[PDB]
DNA sequence: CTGTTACGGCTCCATATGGAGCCGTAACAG
DNA sequence: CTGTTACGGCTCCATATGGAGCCGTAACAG
């Protein structure tokens, strides 16, 4: 009846152990990336997944992949578990919101049972060929490439290579497309220098859609081989379509869709079903009409249902389940959604909420549920609704482990596990355990210290004012915006906030950023609706802050990203011993040959292949992971070597380089970034989202002052303790005082309190918004009665 | 707290419903393939697997495969479940008995912690390259092809095609190997007519192992293409090795291993580890020495452990877990096994028992466990041990659903679910529910009828005697046989039985059957140890009875298998209307063109492809599944058509053809096969193991009398009710009275009682046997005190 | 009339080159 | 000394033909 773990040594697990009670509401929190989150993510979940997947069918076990065994000694009292992560999937257009909502099939069954034609339940579905629209083969649209995007260079000759698609080059002899181009030219007797615009329509059709698969001879003359073969040219369009059909990568899919556009099927149009299916009328509405309705209006519509007595009797189960699913969806809070809406077009938090609602509807109790950041992407009322839903799910009879930072969740929690006190070598130990009251009584918990109010976010005594430099965006009607006009000043720590799903963040991410990037940084991406933008001359450069990893290659290090490695190499080159040895400054760098270990090429790992086992990585024995030649490593400066510096700690580095101001300024920048515990040479892939964000903000701070720069941060409060939030707020204020501009779209109460100009967009999400709710100083905004954000700010202040 | 299902319509589920209590021991039983087993296998398990796999990671969901949705209305109160099926997997040689037993890692950790060199725990393992034997790369053997099996025809010329391996033909110009042969001949200037024996050693080495990958020109002259290319010939051996490495099919793997043999690595030899690893001595033994020990002797060895006080203190967990695992393995009853034994070399029942033991050791409680036929492959004492283990696992806190026929399991069960009364259209309804007592009180349950003793297997009043015709096998020492001599008479319903894992069944399946097949049916398979076989002239033909499907293609039907379709076609051809129409007798057959529907080619299904969906099968609209042309189907004989006859029922067919003795004799043979409920034209793939066995026995019965035939049945009692066992026994007696011979190796008490001559091999499984325990009439055998089977027979009698 | 063998026909299963992002280096301007 | 731009180099990710078993048909013997 307990989750007992002993001898855990994952990452920074200092052989910690704890007894987790079953069938309760326990929350684990700590410092940003302190290791408690990693432990909870990768010890219990990994043990359960291994103990389950293995015991399953062997073939399915290798199909789903063999999970790596953990370093924990033994785990007792475990159970099968599910993970509601934050990394969404592109999925396929065949997937639908109703399909993943576990409501489309129920709606189809209800329509088949109760609805009348103007009758098999299979015909109501749109995934089986027994009832499909042939025009779009059930897809709803028509993914066709754009002839104006593949080879728009009409004036360019055929030999010039107007078509820029990969594998279709015509100016390269070594290209695989050169043989096909030569065969087509032989079959057409047309000069390759003819312009694309001047090409005959028949020749253009043959090039695009192929030569109807007729027999044709293609000549091949390689360096050491020659001959000819009979084949057919499908054409550029057909080749691209086949490649897209055979594609299985999200990046390749996005690249291919960049040159294509799915034209909504005109025959069916949001139906993807046979005409006669729409004839089934239930309550004077169609299945598509029901699906396109909003969740709240759908609940209202199904509440006013009225039919025959037999229909009511048969509805004692189907309609009851439909009502329960609608109520669960309402409790999720994502009312600004449609059953017919595209599954892919959704936020990560929205996807997590939808998955939670589907799990609640399923009712599979007696399991372990591990969620991540439920508070992210929700308003205060949404937080209350999520807490109620979590309490209900716990009442269903399962033990839940959540990781978050919302104070209300901790108050509603039963047992709290805190790991600290610091991060890395400064933490990794269980500070305390028990309920909230004794956690507050505990004087060794940083979370308890923040709860007790000893350290609190003091509201600023003074607020900055605009300097007359404003950016004007008026008439934008992208997504759900109803031609809204917003006056956004620049030069202060202003922010935009509102209820969940209002779309203001979508507007900022899809219109303003795209326009600014196209204007300044020359980014060729089509933006959304945009009438006019003013104040363009005020700013010069714009940058973005996201959660993307700094680098996907192991050839990069955070020291390289910050550039301190260059100063270190220069200092090493300035050494008298280095000058005597004649070593170049470039030799003190692992990225290039000259000093790197030739055995592993500086990678530090070796690949070993087995007949019945996958690739195995082991440390390189020649250089023992030092990634430096012995002769190069023989140099010593101030009692330290280049390898030692690369393996050194930032906390030690700050005290080490007390006489190197050039390096020191970046050192103290990194220290003020609040990431001194991070290794100076940690692997780039090993970095977490918080670490990457800290690195990016440190790099931004180290940048020279310009006074005409703007920054956009997407939910910086995600994955951060209250002290981390305070540090981030201080960094934001110092960046604003530097002379740049800050744009923030978040929902943290402390961040809103620290703001100087609040922008409100509402008054409801989805179709219920599109108008600027209010604007002004936070004190003036709190005076507005018709604003949830204003009421929350007034309560906070 | 209940498993509630309503509106289930899977196969023959007549909208049945039932409430299954949770956390109990409930057993479901019924007629052979009555549908209750299929329901329990494919309703609850399918619902749980879907509700789990889906909610998991999406990418893993498509990796493991999307389970099809069931036809049930809704399932309430479900839980994640695991399935211990009977279909084993070939797996890989890297897999080990200790690995799947979850004991190899524990043993390695114990050896690392306690053992002393003559020290990292990773070096003890044999799956990581950090400690491996390079000779065999951890495999233990060396899978090399046999030069005496690839092209043994030394006298055959190179052009003749001595190498019979697929893709290496030399006598076929169109073969892909012809170009390589021509290139090799050009590079060697050797005549293709030279004998393989007369080929120079250098030429043979070049052919086998390749030409060291050197540059070579291969000429190609196709019908419409020509040219040449520079490439290298890896050789026959290298090509076969690469194909085996790239192989991913069990059938292809078996075909390739038919020409290969894994020679035990001589460097390591049952070690696959680095020399220094064997230096670690624990209790005066090696890790391999511990693994090769029997389970019981290993438990005894670890019981006498004695080390330092620190070792004992550290062993409070590791040694306790090892002892618990050993005790669980002992409770499994598979004492005749070794930790170092090959994982693949095991029986299906042994694999199921091992999986059950591993699951018990895991301790993941609060789940649903569905096993199949625990009694199969076990002795009476093993049945008691399995019942105790199941009771323990239920005490661990999980709800178990077992399907079996052992009376002891029903007695130990709490709730029993019986579905009947018949099969197919004659059953599919819940007969009764409750405990065993009220089940016996219920007069409508066939299981209760058998339990009450109203219908019982009467012991035969007289037993047949040998007619002096005997088969003598003496000195066979295959597997664990210790040069045993057995006198097996022929001409009576004799049988061989013993304790589980004795190996006598393995001896019969690996020596006697192989020798008989090679002698009579000309089967070229190498048998095991065999000194001499006598009485060969007594028998003429030998046949085998297994659980393999009758046919993997949908072009075959049970009517075609039994041959009644030929008589039906002849009768239809004899019709006056058919003679007037001039239709040939072959037209009344769907297998060939002439009368079949050209739209579906007689398949009856159509394939529809979608861009984002897999292949979909739908009934063919042109012929509506009748699989006959309209003009051909227009004929009517005795008020019925050929399509109607093909779709008719056997129970109706027996009354239909009362004036057709030629067909009637096979009709009543099929009826006596006890499978009248089966459709006369059911799909071959749709047939179950019991149905296939019934079909095979019916075909054997319909065979003309010869008096010199023998039959071998492998566990016919599997998947059969007590009445089904009675019917099978009666069929066996009638087959024996026909004039043939019957050899049975099973463990059913009723089958043993019905036997006339019992062969006993023991006295213990594995290394504890190899000697004939006893022999004689069942009454005389019961008088033997030193025989578990004899004691069981005496108790039964 | 029945069993066996041989042959033909059918079906299902099996087996290397181009592009984007990042790091290091050189050059130019303030 | 510092910031910016341009170029070169490096790495990781991406995109049809032969064989075994079965059914139907013809021929031959009892
Ligand atoms: Zn359409
Ligand atoms: Zn190295
Ligand atoms: Zn070896
Ligand atoms: Zn058809």
Q: DSSP string covering A650-709, please?
A: HHHHHHH-TT-HHHHHHHHHHHHTT-TTSBTT--TTT--HHHHHHHHHHHHHHSPP-S-E
> Between the CA of residue A664 and those of A671, A704, B752, what are the distances in Å?
10, 15, 90
DSSP label at residue A85: -
Chain A residue with Cα closest to B92 = A612
What gap in Å lies between CA B377 and CA B765, rounded to an integer? 13
Query: Is B80 touching A (CB cutoff 8 A)?
Result: yes
Best of B47, B55, B273, B398 to substitute, by most chain A Cβ atoms within 10 angstroms, is B55
Radius of gyration of chain A (CA): 31
Rg for chain B (alpha carbons), in Å?
Answer: 31
Please give the class, per CATH, of domain B143-262. mainly alpha
Do the chains contact at A612 and B355, CB–CB below 8 Å?
Answer: no
Hey, are the CB atoms on B138 and A76 less than 8 Å from each other?
A: no
User: Residue B392: CB partners within 8 Å, gap ≥ 6?
Assistant: B331, B360
By C-alpha distance, which of A485, A381, A484 is closest to A788?
A381
Q: How far apart are CA A414 and CA A21, in angstroms?
A: 10
Question: What is the Cα–Cα distance from B445 to B432, expressed in whole angstroms?
Answer: 7
B649 C-beta less than 7 Å away from strand C:
no
Q: Which residues of A touch B317 (CB under 8 A)?
A: 73-74
What residue in B sits closest to A227 (Cα-Cα)? Answer: B227
Torsion, Cα of B126, B127, B131, B134 (10° steps): 90
- Sequence-ordered list of residues with C-beta below 8 angstroms from that of A422, at least 6 positions apart, any chain: A31, A34, A677
Cβ separation A363–B76 shorter than 8 A: yes
Question: A362 vs B51: CB contact, 8 Å cut-off?
Answer: yes
* Residue A386 CB contacts under 8 Å (≥ 6 apart), including other chains: A333, A353, A374, A375, A378
Determine contact: A612 vs chain B, CB below 8 A: yes
* Contact between B317 and A74 using a beta-carbon 8 Å cutoff: yes
Residues A408 and B81: their CA atoms lie apart, in Å, by 36
What's the burial of B650, exposed, middle or buried (CB within 10 Å: 0-12/13-18/19+)? Answer: buried
Q: Which ligand is nearest to the CA of B135?
A: 3
Is A618–B129 a contact, with Cβ atoms under 8 angstroms apart?
yes
Chain D nucleotides reached by a protein CB under 7 Å = 1-4, 11-15, 17-19, 21-25
Strand C and A485 CB separated by under 7 Å = no
- Nearest C-alpha neighbor of B527 from the set B541, B543, B510, B540: B510
Task: Give CA A244 to chain center in angstroms.
Answer: 24
Mutate to test the interface with A, among B44, B48, B138, B611 (most CBs of A within 10 A): B611
Instruction: Name the residue closest to the C1' of C20 by its CA.
Output: A251
Breaks in chain A (C to N > 2.5 A) come right after 118
Neighbouring-strand partners of residue A260 = A145
Nearest nucleic acid nucleotide to A176, CA to C1' distance: C17
Peptide bond into B628 cis (omega under 30): no
Are B611 and A366 in contact (CB < 8 Å)? no
Quote the CATH superfamily of domain B470-549+704-796: P-loop containing nucleotide triphosphate hydrolases (3.40.50.300)
The answer to whether strand D lies under 7 Å from the CB of residue A249 is: yes
Long-range contacts at B43-47 (CB < 8 A, ≥ 24 apart): B43/B5, B43/B8, B43/B10, B43/B13, B43/B70, B43/B72, B43/B75, B44/B3, B44/B5, B44/B75, B44/B78, B44/B81, B44/B368, B44/B370, B44/B401, B45/B81, B45/B83, B45/B370, B46/B70, B47/B72, B47/B75, B47/B78
Check A225 against B225: CB less than 8 A apart: no
- CB-based contact B51 A224, cutoff 8 Å: no
Q: Is A602 left (phi over 0), alpha (psi -120 to 50) or beta?
A: left
Beta-bridge partner residues of B776: B758
- Dihedrals φ, ψ of B624, to 5°? 60, 30
Rounded-to-integer distance, Cα B586 and Cα B595, Å: 9
Strand pairing category for A757-762 and B16-21: unpaired
What lies within 8 Å, CB to CB, of A373 at 6+ separation is A86, A349, A403, A404, A718, A719
CA distance A509 to chain B (A): 27
In sequence order, the 6+-apart residues with CB closer than 8 A to the CB of A17 are A4, A5, A6, A7, A8
Instruction: Give the closest residue to A731 by CA, choosing from A746, A758, A713, A704.
Output: A713
The H-assigned helical ranges of B684-721 are: 689-702
State the alpha helices, DSSP H only, in B138-274.
Answer: 147-150, 176-188, 201-209, 236-246, 250-257
For chain A, say whether B224 makes contact (Cβ under 8 Å): yes
Sheet with strand A74-76: strands edge to edge: A16-21, A2-8, A74-76
Q: Ligand 1: distance of its center to the CA of A265 in Å? A: 5
Does residue B2 belong to the interface with chain A, where contact is any CB pair within 8 Å? no
Cis amide leading into A267 (omega within 30)? no
Spatial distance between the Cα atoms of A538 and A467, rounded to a whole number of angstroms: 11
Nearest 10 degrees: Cα torsion B324, B330, B335, B341: -30
C-alpha span between B412 and A171 (Å, rounded): 81
Q: Cis peptide leading into A649, omega within 30 of 0?
A: no
Determine the residue among B63, B362, B364 to mutate to test chain A binding: the one whose Cβ has the most chain A Cβ atoms within 10 Å: B364
Residue A355 and residue B639: Cα distance in Å, rounded? Answer: 59
DSSP bridge partners of B473: B486, B533
Residue A78: its chain B contacts at CB < 8 A?
Answer: 363-364
Q: Exposed/middle/buried for B128, CB within 10 Å: 0-12, 13-18, 19+?
A: middle
A761 with A498: CB under 8 angstroms?
yes
Task: Write out chain A residues lying below 8 Å of B128, CB-based.
Answer: 616
Within B222-347, residue ranges assigned H as helices are 236-246, 250-257, 275-278, 287-292, 295-303, 309-332
Q: How far is the CA of A142 from the centre of ligand 1 (A)?
A: 8
Contact list in B for residue A362 (CB cut-off 8 A) is 51, 55
> Is CATH 1.10.3720.10 what the domain over A2-88+346-452 is classified as, yes or no?
no
Q: Show Cβ contacts of residue B499 under 8 Å, excluding neighbours closer than 6 positions.
A: B379, B381, B382, B762, B764, B765, B788, B789
Distance from the CA of B343 to the center of ligand 3, in angstroms?
A: 19
CATH class of B97-142+264-332: mainly alpha
Q: Which chain A residue's Cα is nearest to B245?
A: A611
B324 to chain A, minimum CA–CA distance in Å? Answer: 14
Would the CATH topology of A143-262 be identical to that of A470-549+704-796?
no
**Torsion angle of C-alpha atoms A634, A640, A645, A650, degrees rounded to 10:** 170
Q: How far apart are CA A382 and CA B459, in angstroms?
A: 76
Distance CA A759, CA A497 (A): 6
* Angle, CA of A323, A327 and A330, to the nearest 5°: 140
- Cβ partners under 8 Å of residue A480, min gap 6: A336, A503, A766, A767, A769, A770
Q: Which residue of B has its CA nearest to A355?
A: B55
Composition of chain A by helix, strand, coil, percent to 5: 40, 15, 45
Facing residue for A227 by CB, picked from B226, B367, B610: B226
CA–CA gap between residue B259 and residue A110 (Å, rounded): 60
Q: Is A408 exposed, middle or buried (0-12, 13-18, 19+ CB in 10 A)?
A: middle
Measured between CA atoms, how close is B60 to chain A, in angstroms? 5
Mapped onto helix, strand or coil, the DSSP state of residue B678 is coil
B559-660, which class in CATH? mainly alpha
The alpha carbon of residue B733 is apart from the nearest alpha carbon of chain A, in Å, by 40
How far is the C-alpha of B429 from the C-alpha of B14, rounded, in Å?
7
User: Rounded to whole angstroms, how far apart are CA atoms A34 and B195?
Assistant: 75
Chain B residue at shortest CA distance from A360:
B55
Is the CB of residue B62 less than 8 Å away from at least one CB of chain A? no
Using an 8 Å Cβ cutoff, are A335 and A480 in contact? no
Fold of A558-686: ABC transporter ATPase like fold (1.20.1580)
Which distant-in-sequence residues (6+ apart) come within 8 Å of B248 by Cβ?
none
Beta-bridge mates of residue B264: none
The H or E element containing residue A507 is helix A504-507
3-state secondary structure of A735: helix
Of A148, A137, A155, whose CA–CA distance to A208 is shortest? A148
CB of B174 within 7 Å of some strand D atom:
yes
Of B327, B176, B162, the closest CA to residue B239 belongs to B176
Q: Give the three-state DSSP class for A434.
A: strand
Compute the Cα dihedral for A697, A698, A699, A702 and give only its sign: positive
**CA–CA distance, B385 with B399 (Å, rounded to integer):** 19
What phi and psi, each to the nearest 5 degrees, are found at residue A226?
A: -155, 160
Test A89 with B364 for CB contact under 8 angstroms: no
C2 C1' closest Cα residue? B704
Question: Which chain A residues have a beta carbon less than 8 Å from that of B73?
Answer: 317
Report CA dihedral (B624, B627, B632, B634) to the nearest 10 degrees: -40
CB contact under 8 A, A138 and B613: yes
Q: Which sequence spans correspond to the domains of chain B?
A: 2-80+360-452, 97-142+264-332, 143-262, 470-549+704-796, 559-660
CA atoms within 13 A on the CB side of B723: 21
| Of B288, B311, B281, residue with least CA distance to B116 | B281
A397: left (phi over 0), alpha (psi -120 to 50) or beta: left
Enumerate the β-bridge partners of residue A19: A4
On whether the CB atoms of residues B158 and B150 are closer than 8 A, the answer is no
β A771-776/A757-762 pair status? antiparallel
Chain A's closest residue to B142, CA to CA, is: A611
- Residue A453: CB atoms within 10 A of its CB come to 8
Q: Is A364 on the interface with B (CB under 8 A)?
A: yes
Chain B closest-CA separation from residue A64 CA (Å): 5
Q: Could you give the CA distance from residue A747 to residue A758 in angstroms, rounded to a whole number?
A: 12
Chain B positions touching A227 (Cβ under 8 A) are: 220, 225-229
Contact assignment for A80 to B52 by CB distance below 8 Å: yes
Length of chain A: 797
Q: Which residues pair with B26 in a beta bridge?
A: B401, B415
User: Which residues have a Cβ under 8 Å from the Cβ of B280 and sit 6 or more positions away?
Assistant: B111, B112, B115, B116, B117, B118, B119, B124, B286, B287
B308 touches strand D (CB under 7 A): no
Cis peptide bond prior to A421, omega within 30° of 0: yes
Question: Which candidate, B299, B400, B301, places its Cα nearest to that of B356?
Answer: B400
With a 7 Å cutoff on the CB, does A682 touch strand D? no
Quick one: DSSP state of residue B471? Answer: E
Q: Which bases of chain C come closer than 7 Å to a protein CB?
A: 1-4, 11-15, 17-19, 21-25
Nearest to A16 by CA among A3, A30, A5: A5
Name the nearest CA neighbour of A533 among A544, A519, A546, A523: A519
What is the CA(A93)–ligand 1 centre distance, in A? 13
Mind giving me the DSSP string for A280-318?
-BSSS--HHHHHHSBHHHHHHHHHT----HHHHHHHHHH
Structural element, H or E, at residue B36: helix B36-39
**Of A383, A438, A391, A439, whose CA–CA distance to A408 is shortest?**
A383
Three-state secondary structure readout of A214-262: CCEEEEEECCCCEEEEEECCCCHHHHHHHHHHHCCCHHHHHHHHCCEEE
Query: What is the full DSSP assignment across A578-597?
Result: HHHHT--GGGS-TTSTTSS-
Beta strands (DSSP E) in A275-408 are: 368-372, 399-403
Record: fold of B2-80+360-452: Rossmann fold (3.40.50)
Q: Which helix (H) or strand (E) holds A29?
A: strand A25-30
User: How far apart (Å, rounded) are the C-alpha atoms in residues B567 and B786?
Assistant: 56
| SS3 state at A465 | coil
Q: Cα–Cα distance between B187 and B185 in angstroms, integer?
A: 5
Which candidate, A282, A277, A292, places its Cα nearest to that of A116? A282
CB A715 within 8 A of CB A689: no
CA distances from B439 to A618, B414, B554 (A): 64, 11, 41
Decide: B468 and B719 in contact? Cβ < 8 Å.
no
């Amino acid at each position: 009846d307990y989750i007992v773990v002993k001898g855990a040594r994952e990452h920074n697990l200092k052989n910690i152990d704890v007894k987790i009670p079953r069938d309760k509401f326990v929350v684990i929190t700590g410092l940003s990336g302190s290791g408690k989150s990693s432990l909870a993510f990768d010890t219990i979940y990994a043990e359960g997944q291994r103990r389950y997947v293995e015991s399953l069918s062997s073939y399915a076990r290798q199909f789903l992949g063999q999970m790596e065994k953990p370093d924990v000694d033994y785990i007792d009292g475990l159970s099968p578990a599910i993970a509601i992560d934050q990394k969404t999937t592109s999925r396929n257009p065949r997937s639908t919101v109703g399909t993943v909502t576990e409501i489309y099939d129920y709606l189809r069954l209800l329509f088949a049972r109760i609805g009348t034609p103007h009758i098999t339940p299979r015909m109501f579905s749109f995934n089986n060929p027994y009832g499909a629209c042939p025009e779009c083969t059930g897809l709803g649209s028509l993914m066709r490439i754009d002839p104006d995007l593949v080879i728009p260079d009409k004036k360019l000759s055929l030999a010039q290579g107007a078509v820029r698609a990969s594998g279709w080059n015509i100016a390269n002899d070594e290209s695989y497309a050169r043989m096909y181009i030569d065969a087509l030219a032989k079959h057409y007797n047309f000069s390759v220098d003819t312009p694309v615009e001047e090409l005959p329509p028949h020749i253009l059709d043959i090039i695009l859609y192929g030569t109807n698969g007729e027999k044709i001879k293609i000549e091949y003359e390689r360096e050491n081989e020659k001959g000819t073969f009979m084949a057919s040219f499908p054409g550029i369009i057909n080749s691209m379509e086949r490649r897209y059909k055979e594609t299985t990568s999200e990046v390749m899919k996005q690249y291919y869709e960049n040159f294509m556009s799915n034209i909504p099927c005109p025959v069916c149009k949001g139906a993807r079903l046979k005409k006669e299916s729409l004839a089934v009328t239930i309550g004077g509405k169609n299945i598509y009409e029901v699906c396109c309705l909003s969740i709240g209006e759908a609940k209202e519509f199904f509440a006013n249902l009225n039919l025959t007595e037999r229909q009511q009797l048969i509805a004692r189960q189907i309609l009851k389940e439909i009502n329960a699913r609608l109520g669960f969806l309402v409790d999720v809070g994502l009312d600004y959604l449609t059953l017919a809406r595209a599954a892919g077009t959704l936020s990560g938090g929205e996807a997590q909420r939808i998955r939670l609602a589907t799990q609640i509807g399923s009712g599979l109790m007696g399991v372990i549920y591990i969620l991540d950041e439920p508070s992210i992407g929700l308003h205060q009322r949404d937080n209350d609704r999520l807490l109620r839903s979590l309490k209900k799910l716990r009442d269903l009879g399962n033990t839940l482990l959540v990781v978050e930072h919302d104070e209300d969740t901790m108050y509603a929690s039963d047992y709290i596990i805190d790991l600290g006190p610091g991060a890395g070598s400064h933490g990794g130990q269980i500070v305390a355990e028990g309920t909230v009251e004794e956690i507050k009584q505990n004087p060794n918990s940083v979370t308890g210290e923040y709860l007790s109010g000893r350290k609190k976010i003091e509201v600023p005594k003074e607020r900055r004012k605009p300097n007359g430099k404003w950016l004007e965006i008026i008439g934008a009607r992208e997504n759900n915006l109803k031609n809204i006009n917003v006056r956004i000043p620049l030069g202060v720590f202003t922010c935009i906030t509102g209820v969940s799903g209002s779309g203001a963040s979508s507007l900022i991410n899809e219109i303003l950023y795209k326009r600014l990037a196209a204007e300044l940084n020359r980014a060729s991406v089509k933006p959304g609706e945009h009438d006019l933008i003013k104040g363009i001359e005020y700013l010069d450069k714009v940058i973005d802050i996201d959660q993307s990893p700094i680098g996907r290659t192991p050839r990069s290090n955070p020291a390289t990203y910050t550039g301190v490695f260059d100063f270190i190499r220069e200092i090493f080159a300035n050494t008298t011993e280095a000058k005597t040895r004649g070593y170049k400054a470039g030799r003190f760098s692992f990225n290039v040959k000259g000093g790197r270990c030739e055995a592993c090429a500086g990678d530090g790992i070796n690949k070993i292949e087995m007949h019945f086992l996958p690739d195995i990585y082991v440390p390189c024995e020649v250089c023992k992971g030092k990634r430096y030649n012995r002769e190069t490593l023989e140099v010593r400066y101030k009692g330290k070597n280049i390898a030692e510096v690369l393996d050194m700690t930032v906390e030690e580095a700050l005290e080490f380089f007390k006489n190197i101001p050039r390096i020191h300024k970046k050192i103290e920048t990194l220290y003020d970034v609040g990431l001194g515990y991070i290794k100076l040479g940690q692997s780039s892939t090993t970095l977490s989202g918080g670490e990457a964000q800290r690195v990016k903000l440190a790099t931004e701070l180290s940048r020279k002052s310009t006074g005409k720069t703007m920054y956009i941060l997407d939910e910086p409060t995600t994955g951060l303790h209250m002290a981390d939030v305070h540090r981030l707020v201080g960094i934001l204020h110092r960046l604003v005082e530097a002379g740049n501009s800050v744009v923030v779209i978040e929902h943290n109460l402390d961040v809103i309190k620290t703001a100087d100009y609040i922008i409100d967009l509402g008054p409801e999400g989805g179709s219920g918004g599109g108008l600027v709710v209010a604007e002004g100083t936070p004190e003036e905004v709190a005076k507005v009665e018709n604003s949830y954000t204003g009421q929350f700010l007034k309560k906070v202040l």
